[PDB]
Amino acid sequence: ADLKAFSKHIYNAYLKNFNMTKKKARSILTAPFVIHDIETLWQAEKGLVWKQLVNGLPPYKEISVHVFYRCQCTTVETVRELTEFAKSIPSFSSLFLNDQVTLLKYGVHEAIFAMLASIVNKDGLLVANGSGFVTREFLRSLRKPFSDIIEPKFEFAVKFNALELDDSDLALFIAAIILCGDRPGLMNVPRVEAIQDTILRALEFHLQANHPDAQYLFPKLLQKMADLRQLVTEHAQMMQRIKKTETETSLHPLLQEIYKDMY
Ligand SMILES: O=C(O)CCCCCOc1ccccc1CN(C(=O)c1ccc(-c2ccoc2)cc1)C1CCCC1
Ligand SMILES: CCCCCCCO[C@@H]1O[C@H](CO)[C@@H](O)[C@H](O)[C@H]1O
Ligand SMILES: CCCCCCCO[C@@H]1O[C@H](CO)[C@@H](O)[C@H](O)[C@H]1O
């Protein structure tokens, strides 16, 4: 059907399902309590409202692990949102449920690291629904291997933010990431490949209207999708190293299901 109406339905599903949009994020980043060390982190854990109460975080262990647990909490919450967003797409919900799980399994991290740029600048990122701002420099200061899993996302993010997508672009781009026919173990590859093609056509149609003067932005974005696959590969490898060497660190079982059969 019409790609304009298609794009608009995806945009609405996005606004309906993501509490933090790039619009809101940039309105904040241009105030949040700044977290740049242990003291301000401690002040934040007492004065800021977090979706997940510390309380129920895995019992405390140390500062680098505590930050990791907050990262893991926000990841799982974003997987939740991405799942409802995908289900809010009729062609996704028409797939058999096992293919829906396959697509989410192998796509959510690519999508999540794409959306992360919306809440990032070169100096840190928003946390706790925009009420906090954690400094990139602080996160660099965590002990390995926790610092190493973080900085690569910043690098991708700052480059990705140079393309100046808005939320209406992102909605289509994230949909293209999820509805990807290359994922291992997909049952109905032709059906998923055909949905992906419609989304990609819609995306190019959208960028022509929304970004009339930006040449090469569509192929640029196709390359970011390739880049995101490599970012997630390396991320999954780092998470396997943490599972092996940080045996006291608690790993959410949903995320371990995601990494189970990755290499
Ligand atoms: O994938 C897993 O197994 C979970 C393991 C991810 C570990 C690496 O997480 C990050 C790496 C780079 C940038 C951002 C994140 C995490 N992150 C965050 O939103 C985030 C970052 C920091 C804090 C925080 C609070 C107090 O002090 C620090 C809270 C939340 C987003 C990445 C995408 C989905 C959420
Ligand atoms: C409408 C759903 C009806 C039941 C579908 C049964 C699906 O089987 C399982 O799907 C999973 C992917 O999600 C794979 O990980 C498993 O290897 C596979 O055995
Ligand atoms: C919540 C949406 C995202 C969920 C991603 C988690 C995927 O885990 C997979 O669930 C399948 C069905 O149980 C199993 O067959 C696989 O072994 C397991 O790898």
Question: Residue 65 and residue 143: Cα distance in Å, rounded?
Answer: 9
- Note the residue count of the chain: 263
Question: Residue 32 and residue 71: Cα distance in Å, rounded?
Answer: 18
Strand-pair category, 124-127 with 132-135:
antiparallel
Question: Residue 135 and residue 89: Cα distance in Å, rounded?
Answer: 35
Q: Both tokens of residue 82? A: 């991405």
Ligand 3 site: residues with CB under 6 angstroms?
A: 79, 83, 101, 104-105, 257-258, 260-261
Other residues' Cβ atoms within 10 Å of the Cβ of residue 118: 24
Experimental method: X-ray
In the sheet that 124-127 helps form, which strands lie side by side, from edge to edge?
A: 33-35, 132-135, 124-127, 120-121
- The answer to whether residues 218 and 172 touch, using CB atoms and an 8 Å cutoff, is no
Ligand 3 atom 19 nearest Cα: 257
Q: Both tokens of residue 24? A: 């809101």
Domains and CATH numbers, the chain: 1-263 (1.10.565.10)
Closest CA to 220 of 257, 182, 173: 173
Question: Residue 134 and residue 196: Cα distance in Å, rounded?
Answer: 35
For residue 112, give the ligand 1 atom closest to its CA.
33
- Give the closest ligand to the alpha carbon of residue 262: 3
Q: Please provide the distance, in angstroms rounded to a whole number, between the alpha carbons at the two ends of the chain.
A: 38
Q: What is the phi/psi pair of residue 85, to 5°?
A: -60, -50
Tell me the three-class secondary structure of the chain, residue by residue. Answer: CCHHHHHHHHHHHHHHHCCCCHHHHHHHHCCCEEECCHHHHHHHHHHCCCCCCHHHCCCCCCHHHHHHHHHHHHHHHHHHHHHHHHHCCHHHHCCCHHHHHHHHHHHHHHHHHHHHHHHEECCEEEECCCCEEEEHHHHHHCCCCCCCCCHHHHHHHHHHHCCCCCHHHHHHHHHHHHCCCCCCCCCCHHHHHHHHHHHHHHHHHHHHHHCCCCCCHHHHHHHHHHHHHHHHHHHHHHHHHHHHHCCCCCCCHHHHHHHCCCC
Q: Which residue has the tokens 């209406």?
A: 168
Question: Residue 79 and residue 191: Cα distance in Å, rounded?
Answer: 23
Beta bridge partners of 35: 134
For residue 78, give the ligand 1 atom closest to its CA.
34
Question: Residue 155 and residue 59: Cα distance in Å, rounded?
Answer: 31
Question: Residue 140 and residue 64: Cα distance in Å, rounded?
Answer: 10
Question: Residue 188 and residue 81: Cα distance in Å, rounded?
Answer: 24
Question: Residue 192 and residue 174: Cα distance in Å, rounded?
Answer: 15
Other residues' Cβ atoms within 10 Å of the Cβ of residue 166: 15
Question: Residue 115 and residue 21: Cα distance in Å, rounded?
Answer: 9
Residue 145: asked if its preceding bond is cis (omega within 30°), the reply is yes
State the resolution, in angstroms. 1.8
Among 93, 98, 188, 191, which residue has the most ligand 2 atoms within 8 Å of its CB, making it the best to mutate?
98
Ligand 2 atom 7 nearest Cα: 98
Read off the amino acid at residue 72: Q
Ligand 2 site: residues with CB under 6 angstroms?
A: 96-98, 101-102
